[PDB]
From Swiss-Prot, chain A:
Belongs to the p53 family. Deacetylation by SIRT2 impairs its ability to induce transcription activation in a AKT-dependent manner. Lactylation by AARS1 prevents ability to undergo liquid-liquid phase separation (LLPS), thereby inhibiting transcription factor activity. The chain holds residues 363 to 377 of 393 of the full protein. This is Cellular tumor antigen p53. Forms homodimers and homotetramers. Binds DNA as a homotetramer. Interacts with AXIN1. Probably part of a complex consisting of TP53, HIPK2 and AXIN1. Interacts with histone acetyltransferases EP300 and methyltransferases HRMT1L2 and CARM1, and recruits them to promoters. Interacts (via C-terminus) with TAF1; when TAF1 is part of the TFIID complex. Interacts with ING4; this interaction may be indirect. Found in a complex with CABLES1 and TP73. Interacts with HIPK1, HIPK2, and TP53INP1. Interacts with WWOX. May interact with HCV core protein. Interacts with USP7 and SYVN1. (Microbial infection) Interacts with cancer-associated/HPV E6 viral proteins leading to ubiquitination and degradation of TP53 giving a possible model for cell growth regulation. This complex formation requires an additional factor, E6-AP, which stably associates with TP53 in the presence of E6. The gene is TP53. It is linked to TP53 is found in increased amounts in a wide variety of transformed cells. TP53 is frequently mutated or inactivated in about 60% of cancers. TP53 defects are found in Barrett metaplasia a condition in which the normally stratified squamous epithelium of the lower esophagus is replaced by a metaplastic columnar epithelium. The condition develops as a complication in approximately 10% of patients with chronic gastroesophageal reflux disease and predisposes to the development of esophageal adenocarcinoma. Esophageal cancer: A malignancy of the esophagus. The most common types are esophageal squamous cell carcinoma and adenocarcinoma. Cancer of the esophagus remains a devastating disease because it is usually not detected until it has progressed to an advanced incurable stage.
Curated annotation (Swiss-Prot), chain B:
There is a cross-link at residue 83 (Glycyl lysine isopeptide (Lys-Gly) (interchain with G-Cter in SUMO1)). It comes from Homo sapiens. There is a cross-link at residue 83 (Glycyl lysine isopeptide (Lys-Gly) (interchain with G-Cter in SUMO2)). Double-strand break (DSB) repair protein involved in response to DNA damage, telomere dynamics and class-switch recombination (CSR) during antibody genesis. Plays a key role in the repair of double-strand DNA breaks (DSBs) in response to DNA damage by promoting non-homologous end joining (NHEJ)-mediated repair of DSBs and specifically counteracting the function of the homologous recombination (HR) repair protein BRCA1. In response to DSBs, phosphorylation by ATM promotes interaction with RIF1 and dissociation from NUDT16L1/TIRR, leading to recruitment to DSBs sites. The chain holds residues 1484 to 1603 of 1972 of the full protein. Changing residue 41 to A: Loss of interaction with histone H4 that has been dimethylated at 'Lys-20' (H4K20me2). Abolishes recruitment to double strand breaks. Loss of interaction with histone H4 that has been dimethylated at 'Lys-20' (H4K20me2). The gene is TP53BP1. This is TP53-binding protein 1.
Amino acid sequence: RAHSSHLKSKKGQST
Amino acid sequence: GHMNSFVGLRVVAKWSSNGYFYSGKITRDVGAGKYKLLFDDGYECDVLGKDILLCDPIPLDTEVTALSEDEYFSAGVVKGHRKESGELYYSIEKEGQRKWYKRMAVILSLEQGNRLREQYGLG
């Protein structure tokens, strides 16, 4: 296991 | 140890699919100017020297993306520095508040990172 997706700028992640 | 040719250095690098410049550690010179980068979030892809910034402690007054490591995304400006747990931190003034984020949470959107690629670019 690891932490979450962080940011992957290839798509939006709608904060 | 003190210095080595690329492999081992903490740097910032472009993630593929026209991504932002994320913090990472050079793992091996893949070849032809590609170096593989262990991004600080644990990910591993290859990146060309043109697209790696190796002398990039984020300057104060640089605009940056702040990234709560779970994913929350916003942008702001460096207006301070800290060292804690033997790791590097930045007071990002973000939404009119001074907020501590760490190197891998202080990333450079490609347009911002371009302003440093001209100097810190390996290639």
